[PDB]
User: Fold this.
Amino acid sequence: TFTRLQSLEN
Amino acid sequence: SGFRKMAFPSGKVEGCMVQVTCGTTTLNGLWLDDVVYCPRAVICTSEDMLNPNYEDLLIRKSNHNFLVQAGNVQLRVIGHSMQNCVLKLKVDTANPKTPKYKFVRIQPGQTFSVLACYNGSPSGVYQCAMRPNFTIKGSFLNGSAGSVGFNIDYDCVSFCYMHHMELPTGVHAGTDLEGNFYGPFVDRQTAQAAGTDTTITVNVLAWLYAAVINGDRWFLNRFTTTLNDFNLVAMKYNYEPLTQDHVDILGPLSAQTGIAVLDMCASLKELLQNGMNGRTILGSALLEDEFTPFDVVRQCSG
Amino acid sequence: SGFRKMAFPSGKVEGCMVQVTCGTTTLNGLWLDDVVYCPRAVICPNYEDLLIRKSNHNFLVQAGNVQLRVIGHSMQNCVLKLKVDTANPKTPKYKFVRIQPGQTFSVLACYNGSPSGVYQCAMRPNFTIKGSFLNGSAGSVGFNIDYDCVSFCYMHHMELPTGVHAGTDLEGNFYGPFVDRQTAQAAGTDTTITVNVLAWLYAAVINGDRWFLNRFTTTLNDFNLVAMKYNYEPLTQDHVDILGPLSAQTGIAVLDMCASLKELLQNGMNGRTILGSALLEDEFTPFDVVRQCSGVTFQ
Ligand code: NA
Ligand code: NA
Assistant:
């Protein structure tokens, strides 16, 4: 986990 | 008069926002002069985000592995380097919209405006504060990394925050524009927890002064307190301790209103000890702590 | 995640703000194409027999250091229109709109023609806005962005004795029962924007705040009868429809949420908070919640 680097995939 | 959670106009920052893609990963970059700044997380392999070795990943990239788009224009990357947790992409074109700017590392309790962006385009602007636990309570979705926080008190844009990540409680962590994280956090998806947050006492007091300036007086009392007695009450409520520096900073507001700082502290003590009695202050039923003494003066400057 | 009072990005508007000075009065103007819009009070009783006596060189319009040549002037309701010899090269795609009570918009507060701050407002049901304005802020503008189009909906004029604010649309029609004269004016009883409260309860659920949900469901007539008693705006079938997207995305029907809101009205918050607020928030529209919780972007 619930620890997210908030980039976007695809 | 009136009192609102006011952000700085975002235009000077909108003109700097670009989209950065490396491989399958996209986020926002900040295009200032001939350098695009963005979180180095963009070079992660979308598979190893628990323990990426960013130095190893970066040396395996070529300039042509980075896709930077400013509107319809694609910018040519001609070099790349890493400063702490921020990647610096040298491009062959200086941003003609670059404002006067500086990078500043702020202290907990300081406020700033956030321009939340996705795919290099702005979604909205709101006001935030660096929490005592070095998180910010933002509004961010996947793709928002690289959004920045800033102040523009004069003509100079002060960049103080670049967004990287969301923690399990839904608060957010990021770096200054030199890539140093605020707080003990790292740009890895390993489990991380924010420490217990506390209320920014000096900001609450500034906001109480803002309320008096706007005509509120119901929460005033005839009492004064010592700094140590107040601090004993404050810690009982998870409030930050008040220092003599804070008392000095509150000077101008105490002078403008004629209410001594420790007299207002006694008001705060009574509000903590006895609650708010279903009443409101400046339209809020809880004590607000994301306006600084400087914010109050600026918004209540006649 | 998270939920903030979010304004639209203000860059498209900042490029239109100019300083307008006539005599000793200085306020803000909005430079769009080759016309500058500003409150007709910059001329100060009897506005026509004061504008006719003005030449074009009575109006000092300044964009930064650049002086704009005024080649004509005209009045529309409570706004003054100054024709200049150059179209603003930064003019965005825009239109003028008149908004309804309950709808929200971003205010760009300006002084001496210079943008100073931006914040998100709601048109109160009594046609005031609860703004933050100081002297010299007249001519500040409120707006929304739909896709790539700027919708100008408000121009600021004055502050009422109670500290709330009044203004016009960009066609000079005042919102509410007000006039642009130095006379004491009252507003009329304000009410709570029920549809926005429901939208904000949906935002709370989207962010995992859900203690207030209850098993019950009410009807629009049962709810409106109780809502009226507490100075809450009635809820129409139109308000129910625009909440649809949030109702579907959360599995909570509007009338279900209304039962929650009806209990919050009659029973209070029991010392708890919702999205970090201890009172019911009513300055988020349903679309406001969608654009923020789905990351809608503008250009
Ligand atoms: Na006191
Ligand atoms: Na219910």
The radius of gyration of chain B is 22 Å. Chain B touches chain A through 30 residues (CB under 8 Å).
